[PDB]
From a paper:
In this study, we have identified the protein PE-H, a novel polyester hydrolase from the marine bacterium P. aestusnigri which hydrolyses different polyethylene terephthalate substrates with mono(2-hydroxyethyl) terephthalate (MHET) as the major hydrolysis product. The PE-H protein shows a canonical α/β-fold consisting of a central twisted β-sheet composed of 9 β-strands flanked by 7 α-helices on both sides, as already reported for homologous structures, i.e., cutinases and PETases. Two disulfide bonds are present in PE-H connecting C214-C251 and C285-C302 as is common for type II PET degrading enzymes.
The crystal structure of PE-H Y250S contained a PEG molecule bound to the protein surface. We furthermore succeeded to significantly increase the enzymatic activity of PE-H toward different substrates by introducing a single amino acid substitution, namely Y250S. This substitution resulted in a rearrangement of the active site conformation, favored by prevention of a polar contact of Y250 located next to the catalytic active histidine, and a loop region of the active site cleft.
Author numbering: 40 to 305
């Protein structure tokens, strides 16, 4: 692929705290229109353009909740912006609008001569990661046709309508023990509703409470192996990452209580 970055991968490469690039960050003021500000993480030392990803939290949570994803994913070769919403009380439709405004914001930074990410962003290769109500927001955006990869984390929403209309390869992380967005009412029906025409996966984390997809605790191995691979394969067309997503006996992993998907990915 024209978009491939980094060494030929292994589980060890994915399990490491960082990928091949050093990372820097830049704050985006909450005064910005369209969302509550955030932090842009980006790799240093690179040339050319790369995929860009927005990461969004859930109800009454801040960007810190999901910020493990920022440096982790950036270090493999992505521009990754973790955001706050306008208020913690925003619901999924509002969160979808703010994901779109944050994506537009990154797109705009690519051509701003003062931006630290000027010229780094392939504005046709965009992804989204979102927790809980932000994961409902993620599925809403996935149904709109712009983004090329979606990772809902312990999603919450009031309908499966948008999941049934997803236009982007979608990996849902579920948390087995979730009592806030119970899997039987949210992540499972949303996955089950996804169309047959997209690459898709459901990874339910064994014993996980509702925060199990956020990163930064005891679940980084599964989150890394599936999550980085998902963005590599779907944003970079990097078929070197298929080996992690299709082949292995996922349910047999101690960290996975349930797996579903439509491998092989073609
Ligand atoms: Cl929520
Ligand atoms: Cl919980
Ligand atoms: Na298992």
């Amino acid at each position: 692929s024209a978009y491939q970055r980094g060494p030929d991968p292994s589980v060890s490469f994915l399990e490491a705290d960082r990928g091949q690039y050093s990372v820097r960050s830049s704050r985006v003021s909450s005064l910005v229109s369209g969302f509550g500000g955030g932090t842009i993480y980006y790799p240093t030392g690179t040339t050319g353009t790369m995929g860009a990803v927005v990461v969004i939290p859930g109800f009454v949570s801040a960007e810190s909740s999901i910020d493990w994803w920022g440096p982790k994913l950036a270090s493999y070769g992505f521009v990754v912006m973790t955001i706050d919403t306008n208020t913690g009380f925003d619901q999924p439709p509002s969160r979808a609008r703010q994901i779109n405004n944050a994506l537009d914001y990154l797109v705009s930074q690519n051509s701003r001569s003062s931006s630290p990410v000027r010229g780094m962003i392939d504005t046709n290769r965009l992804g989204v990661i979102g927790w809980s109500m932000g994961g409902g927001g993620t599925l809403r955006v996935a149904s709109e046709g712009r983004i090329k990869a979606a990772i809902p984390l312990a999603p919450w929403d009031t309908t499966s309508y948008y999941a049934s209309r997803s236009q982007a390869p979608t990996l849902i992380f579920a948390c087995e023990s979730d009592v806030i967005a119970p899997v039987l009412q949210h992540a499972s029906p949303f996955y089950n509703s996804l169309p047959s025409s997209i690459d898709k996966a459901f990874v339910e984390i064994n014993g996980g409470s509702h925060s199990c997809g956020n990163g930064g605790s005891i679940y980084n191995d599964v989150l890394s192996r599936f999550g980085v691979s998902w963005m590599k394969l779907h944003l970079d067309e990097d078929s070197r990452y298929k080996q992690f997503l299709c082949g292995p006996n996922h349910t047999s992993d101690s960290q996975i209580s349930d797996y579903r998907g439509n491998c092989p990915y073609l």
